[PDB]
Design a protein around this ligand. Sequence first.
Ligand SMILES: *[C@@H]1O[C@H](CO)[C@@H](O[C@@H]2O[C@H](CO)[C@@H](O[C@@H]3O[C@H](CO[C@H]4O[C@H](CO)[C@@H](O)[C@H](O)[C@@H]4O)[C@@H](O)[C@H](O[C@H]4O[C@H](CO)[C@@H](O)[C@H](O)[C@@H]4O)[C@@H]3O)[C@H](O)[C@H]2NC(C)=O)[C@H](O)[C@H]1NC(C)=O
Ligand SMILES: *[C@@H]1O[C@H](CO)[C@@H](O[C@@H]2O[C@H](CO)[C@@H](O)[C@H](O)[C@H]2NC(C)=O)[C@H](O)[C@H]1NC(C)=O
Ligand SMILES: *[C@@H]1O[C@H](CO)[C@@H](O[C@@H]2O[C@H](CO)[C@@H](O)[C@H](O)[C@H]2NC(C)=O)[C@H](O)[C@H]1NC(C)=O
Ligand SMILES: *[C@@H]1O[C@H](CO)[C@@H](O[C@@H]2O[C@H](CO)[C@@H](O)[C@H](O)[C@H]2NC(C)=O)[C@H](O)[C@H]1NC(C)=O
Ligand SMILES: *[C@@H]1O[C@H](CO)[C@@H](O)[C@H](O)[C@H]1NC(C)=O
Ligand SMILES: *[C@@H]1O[C@H](CO)[C@@H](O)[C@H](O)[C@H]1NC(C)=O
Ligand SMILES: *[C@@H]1O[C@H](CO)[C@@H](O)[C@H](O)[C@H]1NC(C)=O
Ligand SMILES: *[C@@H]1O[C@H](CO)[C@@H](O)[C@H](O)[C@H]1NC(C)=O
Ligand SMILES: *[C@@H]1O[C@H](CO)[C@@H](O)[C@H](O)[C@H]1NC(C)=O
Ligand SMILES: *[C@@H]1O[C@H](CO)[C@@H](O)[C@H](O)[C@H]1NC(C)=O
Lengths: 371, 49, 49, 294, 470
Amino acid sequence: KINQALHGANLRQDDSVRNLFASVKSSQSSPIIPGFGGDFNLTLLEPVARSAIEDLLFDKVTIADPGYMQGYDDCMQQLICAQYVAGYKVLPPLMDVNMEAAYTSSLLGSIAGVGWTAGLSSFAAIPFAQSIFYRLNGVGITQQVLSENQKLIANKFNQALGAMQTGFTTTNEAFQKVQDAVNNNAQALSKLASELSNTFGAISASIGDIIQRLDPPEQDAQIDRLINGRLTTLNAFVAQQLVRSESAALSAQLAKDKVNECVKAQSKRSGFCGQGTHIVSFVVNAPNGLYFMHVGYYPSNHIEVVSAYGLCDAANPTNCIAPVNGYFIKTNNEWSYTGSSFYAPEPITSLNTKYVAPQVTYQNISTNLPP
Amino acid sequence: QYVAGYKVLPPLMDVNMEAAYTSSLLGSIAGVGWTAGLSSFAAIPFAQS
Amino acid sequence: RLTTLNAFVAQQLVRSESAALSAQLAKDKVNECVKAQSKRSGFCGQGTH
Amino acid sequence: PIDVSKADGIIYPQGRTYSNITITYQGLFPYQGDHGDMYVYSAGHATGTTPQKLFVANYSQDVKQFANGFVVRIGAAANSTGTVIISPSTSATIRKIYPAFMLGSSVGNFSDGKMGRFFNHTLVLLPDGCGTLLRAFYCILEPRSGNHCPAGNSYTSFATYHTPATDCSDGNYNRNASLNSFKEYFNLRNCTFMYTYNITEDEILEWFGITQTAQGVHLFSSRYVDLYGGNMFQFATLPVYDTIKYYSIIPHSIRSIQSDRKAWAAFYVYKLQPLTFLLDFSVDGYIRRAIDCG
Amino acid sequence: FNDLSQLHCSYESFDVESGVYSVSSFEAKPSGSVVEQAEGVECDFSPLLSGTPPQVYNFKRLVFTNCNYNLTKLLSLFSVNDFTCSQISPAAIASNCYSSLILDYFSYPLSMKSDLSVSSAGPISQFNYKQSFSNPTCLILATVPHNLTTITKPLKYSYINKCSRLLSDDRTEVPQLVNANQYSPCVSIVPSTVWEDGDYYRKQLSPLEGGGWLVASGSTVAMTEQLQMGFGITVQYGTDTNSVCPKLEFANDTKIASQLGNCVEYSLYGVSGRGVFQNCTAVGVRQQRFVYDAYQNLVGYYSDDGNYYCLRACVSVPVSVIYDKETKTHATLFGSVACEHISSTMSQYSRSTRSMYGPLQTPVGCVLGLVNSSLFVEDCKLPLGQSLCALPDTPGEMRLASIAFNHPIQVDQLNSSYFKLSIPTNFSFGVTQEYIQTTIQKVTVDCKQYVCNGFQKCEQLLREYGQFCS
Ligand SMILES: *[C@@H]1O[C@H](CO)[C@@H](O[C@@H]2O[C@H](CO)[C@@H](O[C@@H]3O[C@H](CO[C@H]4O[C@H](CO)[C@@H](O)[C@H](O)[C@@H]4O)[C@@H](O)[C@H](O[C@H]4O[C@H](CO)[C@@H](O)[C@H](O)[C@@H]4O)[C@@H]3O)[C@H](O)[C@H]2NC(C)=O)[C@H](O)[C@H]1NC(C)=O
Ligand SMILES: *[C@@H]1O[C@H](CO)[C@@H](O[C@@H]2O[C@H](CO)[C@@H](O)[C@H](O)[C@H]2NC(C)=O)[C@H](O)[C@H]1NC(C)=O
Ligand SMILES: *[C@@H]1O[C@H](CO)[C@@H](O[C@@H]2O[C@H](CO)[C@@H](O)[C@H](O)[C@H]2NC(C)=O)[C@H](O)[C@H]1NC(C)=O
Ligand SMILES: *[C@@H]1O[C@H](CO)[C@@H](O[C@@H]2O[C@H](CO)[C@@H](O)[C@H](O)[C@H]2NC(C)=O)[C@H](O)[C@H]1NC(C)=O
Ligand SMILES: *[C@@H]1O[C@H](CO)[C@@H](O)[C@H](O)[C@H]1NC(C)=O
Ligand SMILES: *[C@@H]1O[C@H](CO)[C@@H](O)[C@H](O)[C@H]1NC(C)=O
Ligand SMILES: *[C@@H]1O[C@H](CO)[C@@H](O)[C@H](O)[C@H]1NC(C)=O
Ligand SMILES: *[C@@H]1O[C@H](CO)[C@@H](O)[C@H](O)[C@H]1NC(C)=O
Ligand SMILES: *[C@@H]1O[C@H](CO)[C@@H](O)[C@H](O)[C@H]1NC(C)=O
Ligand SMILES: *[C@@H]1O[C@H](CO)[C@@H](O)[C@H](O)[C@H]1NC(C)=O
């Protein structure tokens, strides 16, 4: 029964991993080269093999190698080496670390391309700078400031991705979650490796010492007590593994949904995967799971201004216009247009508004008529 | 409760400040859901919303 | 008594995990169709929300 | 008061050492921060170089329960200077001395009726030969019946004098002349065993424990293993046949001359109770940090 | 019978599912035993080999318990002339351990040898020394070796030929019989060396001892060319613990350095188990000799050589199996281990291998049954781990391959105004089948009839439990 339960749990883990990696596998991609991102110094994501962020994340987290090359060989001469003393095998992962590297490379070289058109039929590997241009167009920032303010936003994005390397500490809640997940696996194995010393009412934890000290009629009861304790411990471990695997599968489905929503495409959901209005995301592996980081918009230095709901002619009240992805702003340098997330007063044209049905609620105007 | 002996720990949020949270949500939902993008606040009178 | 406390611990952890999942669901709901007007059918309101 | 973080006065595990790990350990330990029952020995009277009548306290009339054993610190005031008990106006260099203990399950009064006399078998540990010898003997104690003697007249207390000119002879003190002072009040009868130990002199702090087990009392020290440490270590397994209920300290005298009244040290006594500690076994495994639970 | 037998009995069927399975492990056999924590002391025979040996009526005693004695180092010192033993084999006293031993040495020439018998009635068998009737004994009549001066020779051999006690009437005479480990009263009046042959010794007896007079007669035989003497050993089996033993001749196979890096069953004088001893550096307290971990498992030990050792475990390798349905094919795998262990040092039941190349080193471990090949499989069915898989041949053994990565269709990110677009020119409709379990089987159970089955005494017993069914 215990072998059946562990085999079923491992098969569930394996095909859940296979399903998640099949879903995240992009159709088409561009090769990763130096100069990726152009002016953006995003080469930390670029792997030159795992990525530098991935290797730094492996280094900064207390991880013991699961003896896949010389585990018994290092046990010949010198916690992972304590694998047989209780009796258990840590299975190797279903995918190679190089297979993870190939998947992460595919996502990093394809995320610039997939994020331009609805539907995954085509692939659109535009240079990364123009991808950011179109994504910031998508959030409601006018093309004038993007045409005029490339250098400062490039420096802002670069320093934003450069600030997180020194933030690799307790403040990163993601590292805290990775750490106690790894600690959860470690203490789950330590439950097996430690409870052998428990006696459960017996006088010694060693069966051989029991048979070498005692007479058979009482060691029958002693061995029975200790094996009953060990079987109850193993049944509790089976239940713990089952509920942990079920939670892992649910989290895997959630991760697949998240990478299918705001990685391959630009989402609009309020803080579903990025606090603030989301712009882009990036994805790497993690020593137990999957690590996500997201770059989003954060406004500052807000100002209050006066605005309307629509411009209508006094002589022709039927002709009414409404702002498209923006607002109608009265400058105090006579109306003008502003974007939905930045203060950029610019003269109102036909390419940013839509003709709309008239109401009393808008403002009649007959002096400075927009085109 | 003490006859057995166990502390009923109070929640981290009091009544008044969590009520202030709910008041902020009530005052914001009139205007936030009018234009995509969470950057700009749009507190129109509620009937127009 | 220790058996009773062990059972209470297990039940409390199960309820805490269920409460955390419901908390995340409530967070998604309140950022989905409270701060905005979701077009999704019946996710948080029968008929057109 | 004893600091467990400073790791003073802790019984080491009896046979089970570790390394570089912080381990919980149940056993017999003193409470954290105890003032204890510190006593000081003093020298007798002296006019110039004439060895006069003794000068001690009323420690002999005091008896306390052995309970779960106790530990003794020696020479915490060494490498320093302090006052003399018999000469409060004079301060001399603080000199370490070792105390003599007597152990018995019985109670009773002396011939004059003063509390403190023990009956039947009695254990005595006396340091002799200027402290180099550690004589230990579990005998029947017979009081003498002379003047100022316990079975005789004018009895006040029994004391052990130490004449530095005679009892000791800077090397030739192996004549146990302070056991003679013990014989000058008491007599040994029907004795089970008689044990001595050799310990060199120094001016460094010392710790030892007198605490027992069931089948036999034990003698623990740091002297045998860690001179620079203070950890208890099993150096003697004394085979008593009964559990000793009460302990007492013997007042000790010194017949030094007046012009050379050396200032003595203070020794500290801490009783032990069954508790649990946390210990920090270092790479060498000696206890250097520990903490209480309760 | 084999791993597949255990796999079949695990599934309670003749048919199983193809895949990777964990079968019970095996253990490398212990190479031997080491016993080195506490050694005993040696028995003393220097007073036997030194000084003037006293006479036959003055046999001097050495008692032996809790000591080591080696007749190879002991009996070689004797110029052996006469050897007799009763109720014990001669080789047993040099080999077998005993509870206690007593050994009396006395002056005894070879001329007076024939009086040493128990059934004899001569003066030696009457007054001087009598053997043990109820205990096995051994008499050795030896000579001083010519190259041996540490023992000396007395003035003359002497013994008592007539010994008796006269009562208060002075007419009734009682001869004195010496028992085993006894002394005659005439020994008290006969000196350690009788002056000459036919000497008569006399003593007055106290009236409370029956009164009367005590008489004895002593006789002398002069020194020969070299002194001859006698040794008597009486063994005892139930008077002590079986402690006197010969040399522990295991100094070349029970030490730590003799069996470095090999699994042994240590018996460390109170501590026994299975493990591997390795030389190390002195850690922890050197005095306690026993250092353990947090989990009460020993990590090292301080031997008497001054060298500290670490003991980790007697560690072995688990065994896993890969099996395929509808192609009766299987192979064995050992993970996390170099290709170093072959079928020699086994345990448990047996091993399974067919179609007799064998050892194959993979990143998972060492595999028996596979074969190295340059194949790439993207739809593997039997995941061996990492990215390695095996594939049946549709009789042909399993083929090793790596998990084939499916490269996405590459497109070059150009650097100009133009752009290279990927567009599909063909399409299909794919059906994707999914199942969502929305309802478990609504089941009830009738508590009392399940737990009780309608017997009245059972419902009498279950009334006190009460609210569990509710
Ligand atoms: C009264 O005054 C005397 C003399 O001033 C003090 O005695 C000295 O105490 C210090 C304590 O730090 C000793 O220093 C220690 O030396 C150890 C090794 O030295 C010994 O071995 C060498 C080689 O044989 C000799 O040359 C040397 O004389 C010593 O015999 C070191 O290993 C010690 O390092 C330890 O440091 C700390 C703190 O002690 C520990 O926690 C570490 O684990 C480490 O083991 C240390 O450096 C010095 O040797 C002593 N000298 C003499 C002559 O005894 C008394 O301590 C002082 N007493 C009081 C109560 O104040
Ligand atoms: C892009 O960012 C990387 C990461 O900081 C910069 O590379 C570092 O340069 C410093 C300067 O000496 C070195 O000390 C670090 O070792 C480098 N780290 C890595 C990971 O290469 C790089 O200079 C930046 N490039 C640009 C153009 O800004
Ligand atoms: C703007 O001109 C329009 C056109 O006449 C006027 O708005 C009307 O106001 C009346 C009075 O309530 C309403 O009944 C009409 O329905 C409104 N028109 C529309 C199209 O809704 C009004 O004169 C002016 N309003 C403002 C605010 O300037
Ligand atoms: C120290 O005191 C002890 C008390 O017993 C003396 O020890 C024995 O003394 C007797 C004399 O009555 C001797 O026959 C024994 O040989 C002694 N035994 C041992 C082990 O010493 C001892 O003589 C005293 N030391 C002195 C006076 O220097
Ligand atoms: C002793 O334990 C500490 C605990 O962190 C560790 O850092 C140190 O490396 C250990 N010492 C040795 C020699 O391994
Ligand atoms: C102790 O010292 C005395 C005298 O110096 C000596 O007779 C005795 O043998 C010593 N004992 C030990 C164990 O060194
Ligand atoms: C054990 O190792 C120590 C240190 O490496 C070395 O000094 C010693 O000679 C070694 N002993 C043996 C028997 O190999
Ligand atoms: C298997 O074959 C491949 C290619 O022929 C080779 O690179 C590899 O080293 C081989 N492995 C073994 C264990 O023979
Ligand atoms: C763009 O690529 C062409 C090669 O087709 C090269 O000649 C040119 O220098 C490149 N322009 C850059 C890197 O700005
Ligand atoms: C599309 O692919 C199918 C599958 O082979 C083929 O039968 C069909 O002719 C293809 N259609 C076109 C337009 O290429």
